[PDB]
Amino acid sequence: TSQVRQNYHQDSEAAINRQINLELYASYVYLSMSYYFDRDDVALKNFAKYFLHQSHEEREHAEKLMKLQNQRGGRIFLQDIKKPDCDDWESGLNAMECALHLEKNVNQSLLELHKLATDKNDPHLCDFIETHYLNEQVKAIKELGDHVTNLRKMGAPESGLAEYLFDKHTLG
Amino acid sequence: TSQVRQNYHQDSEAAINRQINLELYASYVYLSMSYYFDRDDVALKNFAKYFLHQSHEEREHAEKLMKLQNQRGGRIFLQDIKKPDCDDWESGLNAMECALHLEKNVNQSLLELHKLATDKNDPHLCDFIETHYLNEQVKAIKELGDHVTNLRKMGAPESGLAEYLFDKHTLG
Amino acid sequence: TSQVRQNYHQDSEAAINRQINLELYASYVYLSMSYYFDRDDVALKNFAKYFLHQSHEEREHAEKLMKLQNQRGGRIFLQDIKKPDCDDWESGLNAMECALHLEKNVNQSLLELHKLATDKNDPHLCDFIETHYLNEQVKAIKELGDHVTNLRKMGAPESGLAEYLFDKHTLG
Amino acid sequence: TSQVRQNYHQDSEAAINRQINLELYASYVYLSMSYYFDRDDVALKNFAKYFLHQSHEEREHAEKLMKLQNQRGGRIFLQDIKKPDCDDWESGLNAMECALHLEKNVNQSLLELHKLATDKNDPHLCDFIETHYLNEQVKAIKELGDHVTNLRKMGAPESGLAEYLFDKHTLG
Amino acid sequence: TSQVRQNYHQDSEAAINRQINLELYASYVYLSMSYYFDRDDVALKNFAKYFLHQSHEEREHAEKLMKLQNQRGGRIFLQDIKKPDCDDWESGLNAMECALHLEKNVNQSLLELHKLATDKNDPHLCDFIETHYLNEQVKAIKELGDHVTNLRKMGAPESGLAEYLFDKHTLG
Amino acid sequence: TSQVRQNYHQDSEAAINRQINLELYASYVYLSMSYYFDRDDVALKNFAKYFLHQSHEEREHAEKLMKLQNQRGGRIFLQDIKKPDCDDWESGLNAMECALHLEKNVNQSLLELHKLATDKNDPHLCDFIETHYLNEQVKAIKELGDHVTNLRKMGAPESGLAEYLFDKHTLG
Ligand SMILES: [Fe+3]
Ligand SMILES: [Fe+3]
Ligand SMILES: [Fe+3]
Ligand SMILES: [Fe+3]
Ligand SMILES: [Fe+3]
Ligand SMILES: [Fe+3]
């Protein structure tokens, strides 16, 4: 046992280890997306910048979870990061839609984790997810929904003018 | 009676009290409009900013009227602010059209008030409405008519590209 | 349903809509109070400034709640803002006492809302009320209790010297 | 009763009063430790600086708890601060080990207090302990565990070179 | 024996250890006083600030005595800090009166200590109490007597206006 | 085929895709290493900082390779990032030794890739590996060999003083 461990269930430690894997996978998906819009046949530079910064943020999220593990006396066990479930992302609209789907998946995993903490009487873990994850996620979900709405309104995916214009004004 | 009251008819005091209620209602309508364009299914950020600043201005208008009441020795009596007559505002064009309709309603109430002052020999009240309200209103009406014209020209409400583009260049 | 809605009960959405109405009413009460102390027969300038800034803060509180509604995929439904339950507020002490009463009413509505979130497993809403409302309210209640205590000590409401002196040193 | 009291159980008030006593005792223990390493026969200047700043922090923690008591309408009742349970602290390693033991004791008292708040439906108190105490404590526990690990690795307590070197590089 | 001990009687060492306990108790009394005037039913903010800074000063006095002990080769032995002899301090005037009483108690303990040094031929200890304690105490006693005089003159404790006014102009 | 593809063999494209996977794996190994030295039972803060920055660099290396793929008209295909082959890294010396082993593995993969380019007449790819990878790798290998030499000289892994001292002076 760790000399610093206090009120840290094995279930929580394990759930944290799984959260790290999911955040790392999310970063990989966004790195796939960013470079999709770097192709000469896509060329949406701002779409690429968006998913690159999202990828970096997800990595920061994983590194914060790993730090918490170490601070709670839990032991970080790492697993394989699976390949993004897609390689060709089609339009910018489909990529935003995929991103929303993945963010709502993380938020749920995070909510399930907050429930575990609430069920194991882990007030510190609760505050941590509330303080550093929950609202961030609600904020990403809303940004993506709005991106998706505007893209659909401007006529994307069929209007390439829209995706290009969306790139210059919003993502730009 | 107030020790500072001089040439202030009861009719004017009452008309001022009613003007305050209308300005407060106008602020509420614009607050409804601003948050309509904050929805994930609308996402017109600049439309939201426009109606938010309009809401703030209408509140300033009410507070100036309340100050005048106190300065003229009139007693401010407040009434219930009714709920904006709409909750779903549809397109950005419909919201601008509603805003014009409400501004022309305030200007008329203001003109009727200027008539009361002119009929009660209240030169101070007259200058006040002339100095702080009338032209402001003519200026809002013209800005809204132009917004409405450009939106209709660009193809709004049916062209979402137009509303989005209108948001980025004019409201933006 | 909203594309961004996740773990957001109808009860919570409705409770948020009601919280917005109460915050808007609180702003109206403080606007009534501010202009009460702008009368020539009252003339407590700092009392007026206090309740004006409180009014503005309550409006900011409502606008933050409306933003949260939009971010959680809830739909903002607005209701009529009732007239402040008083028009003549008597002394500065009575106004502070009314303000305390209304703040403890909001805090309770907020606490009841935090309970609903805790009962619907809404950790995000919980943090939101904890992060942006609860302590703020405890802080307002304490400022008002202290204002009320000092006013009663200095001899207010019967000592006009006290209310005037309280205005210059504390509110001033 | 206090005019500002709302949702504040007697149990919580009492638990807060006891938390204040423990934080004050912790400050006394750290003041004993700081001056232990100021002796001519010890002379670990940085060890002294560490426990002095820790002592000051614990005092700030008590003063924040006393402020919360006053803000919640609870009445601060103070008890005797017991003498630190030790006078000679031996090596720097033993002092760090004592400090860890005492920090894990405070964190537990804090966790028990968070449970009381969670059991009395005190969301404000909950956030307060989460916001200002819990993570701070997890952070102190981890800093001390690491200090203890490095000291044991470098060969302390038997190697005076280690304690001296630890003083110059880490505490220094 | 300490390698640095020279002309340091056991009586002096013990008297220094007792002086430390009294200074620590004085700090506790002032911390009780400071938070008394932070209550919603008292609300004398400047009275609170006064006794808080006094509390901090008394702690500095104890820490200087502990440093001297270490420098003279004496060994610091710590005892329990008793609870302030009061919990409710009534008026600001009574608190000042209590503070004077406690300061004259410390000065006497300090004078008795200076006598011990003069009787044991400890010129260094003599200068230390003369240099860092005696005049400071005479200066605190005079500030408190003057505070007490002005409070009694302005009509305190019965005039709450006085205590409030005293807070804004002198303590303020 | 891509409209920008010219002198880009399928073998090279595939070798680039494999290089990306290896660089991503290297980043994962360094992230495992960094957090190993963040444990309370390890606590080598500078060792953690070293492997964290190395992890970031390897990610930059992968992202540069992905950019080159897009610029040469090759299509990025991503595969699963395997879990670092170790979870407990033992001493700081073993971690450096592992890092050397992995860097010499990447350099070889890079050299094999430079051979493929030289064999397919791809002068651009050749310069790219020469310009951005080869020397960097020779420079990392030498830094790690030197780190390993100094650690072994100072007595690590058995001397914890050495690892701690190595952390403060070199990594520090
Ligand atoms: Fe994330
Ligand atoms: Fe207006
Ligand atoms: Fe509010
Ligand atoms: Fe503490
Ligand atoms: Fe003193
Ligand atoms: Fe690399």
Residue numbers in the entry:
A (entry chain D), B (entry chain Q), C (entry chain F), D (entry chain E), E (entry chain X), F (entry chain C): 6 to 177
Publication excerpt:
Here we report the use of “Build and Retrieve” to define the composition of a raw human brain microsomal lysate. From this sample, we simultaneously identify and solve cryo-EM structures of five different brain enzymes whose functions affect neurotransmitter recycling, iron metabolism, glycolysis, axonal development, energy homeostasis, and retinoic acid biosynthesis. Collectively, the BaR approach was then used to reveal enzyme identities and solve cryo-EM structures of these brain enzymes with resolutions ranging between 2.69 and 3.40 Å. Interestingly, malfunction of these important proteins has been directly linked to several neurodegenerative disorders, such as Alzheimer’s, Huntington’s, and Parkinson’s diseases.
FT is an iron storage protein characterized by its unique α-helical architecture designed to uptake iron. FT is widely recognized as a critical protein for iron metabolism, particularly in the brain. It participates in providing iron availability for cellular demand and is also responsible for protecting cells against damage from iron-mediated free radicals. We then determined the structure of this enzyme to a resolution of 2.69 Å. Human FT assembles as a 24-subunit oligomer, creating an overall spherical structure. Each subunit of FT presents an all α-helical structure and forms an elongated four α-helical bundle and a short C-terminal α-helix. The bound Fe3+ binds in the middle of the four helical bundle, intimately interacting with residues E28, E63, and H66 of FT.
